[PDB]
Ligand binder design. Structure first.
Ligand SMILES: [Zn+2]
Ligand SMILES: [Zn+2]
Ligand SMILES: [Zn+2]
Length: 358
């Protein structure tokens, strides 16, 4: 995985805050996932911030809001600067010991989770793009006007990108909309049977399922049960689709023994009945599904039991989407941020090399 520094601008650190990143002139956070926050509240970083006072953390407005709902990251409050989306922003990078560098940064939406962005950096050592984690459908990058200069793509020296599914096996993944529609109709078909029919959405403990919860809630007139919603206190379009009350037909609550509970007709939050009538529960597990280059799309819903389902859902681009994105960017260099499970860095680097100028 990416270790925080791009070769072209080593004085900035993105999505990694330990080790060599303790000497950054500026920090950037693409989104609030733990794997991109390593060292972000380490005592050594706090120590370092107390002496170096012109060092800031930059992120999207939503990332700022989410980060600071955690008590443990509140110390960042005085040093966090949000940057508006697709608003090129001049940043000064001071050597605390004479040097001054200026860069321009533009935040582009990444489609990965609330607040998730890509960072385009422009300065006197070339233009580089750090994608963070992204899921962009074919055509979306071409519509981003700030990736372009006079009708063609900007000259991009290096792209540091999300290669989670950068393997030909993961050729195509169903779109966001297809995934949502499949889950929507499954839930609708169940919870309209009676008030005692309920769904458990078995989700990972991470941001990124909120557009699923909001659309289910908006379309079906039901709030989704969650463990904690205080991070969305100041986010009305998300907040009002969620609830901490157990008395609802859609649940996205969690705990360590949640899957055992479901096998005994119990939701994670412990509700098993209403008016002493047993709830009729189905489980739906958002899970990445894909199809090969020479294959056809199949159902986004996969039944795994009498009462259990998997539902296509992806946080990251498919291989065909990565290739399309990088082909379009046509950078000099492309560096993988992520080595997939059963592959190597050489395999990934060489997959992408044909799309690059060097
Ligand atoms: Zn992520
Ligand atoms: Zn990640
Ligand atoms: Zn619940």
């Amino acid at each position: 995985s990416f270790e925080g520094q791009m070769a072209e601008y080593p004085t900035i650190s993105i999505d990694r805050f330990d080790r060599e990143n303790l000497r950054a002139r500026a920090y950037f956070l693409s989104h609030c996932h733990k794997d991109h926050m390593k060292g972000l509240r380490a005592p050594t970083l706090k120590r370092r911030l107390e002496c170096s006072l012109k060092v800031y953390l930059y992120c999207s407005p939503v990332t700022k809001e989410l980060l600071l709902t955690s008590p443990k990251y509140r110390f960042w409050k005085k040093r966090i600067i949000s940057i508006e989306i697709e608003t090129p922003t001049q940043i000064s990078l001071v050597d605390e010991s004479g040097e001054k560098e200026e860069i321009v940064v533009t935040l582009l939406p990444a489609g990965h989770c609330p607040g998730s962005v890509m960072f385009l950096f422009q300065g006197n050592n070339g233009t580089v793009l750090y994608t963070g984690d992204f899921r962009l459908a074919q055509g979306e990058a071409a519509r981003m006007e700030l990736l372009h200069s006079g009708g063609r793509v900007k000259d991009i020296q290096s792209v540091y990108l999300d290669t989670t599914f950068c393997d030909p096996r993961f050729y195509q993944i169903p779109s966001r909309e297809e995934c949502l529609s499949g889950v929507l109709e499954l839930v609708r078909s169940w919870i309209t049977r009676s008030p005692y029919h309920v769904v458990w959405l078995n989700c990972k403990a991470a941001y990124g399922y909120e557009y699923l919860f909001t659309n289910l809630s908006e379309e079906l007139g039901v709030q989704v049960h969650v463990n904690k919603l205080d991070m969305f206190r100041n986010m009305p379009e998300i907040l009002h689709h969620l609830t901490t009350d157990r008395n609802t037909q859609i649940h996205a609550c969690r705990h360590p023994k949640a899957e055992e509970y479901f096998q005994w007709s119990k939701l994670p939050c412990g509700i098993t009945s209403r008016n002493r009538i047993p709830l009729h529960i189905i489980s739906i597990k958002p899970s990445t599904m894909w199809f090969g280059e020479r294959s056809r799309k199949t159902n986004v819903i996969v039944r795994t039991g009498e009462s259990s389902y998997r539902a296509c859902f992806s946080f990251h681009s498919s291989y065909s989407e990565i290739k399309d994105f990088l082909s379009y960017l046509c950078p000099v260099n492309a560096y993988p941020n992520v080595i997939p499970v059963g592959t190597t860095m050489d395999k990934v680097v060489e997959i992408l090399k044909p799309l690059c100028r060097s």
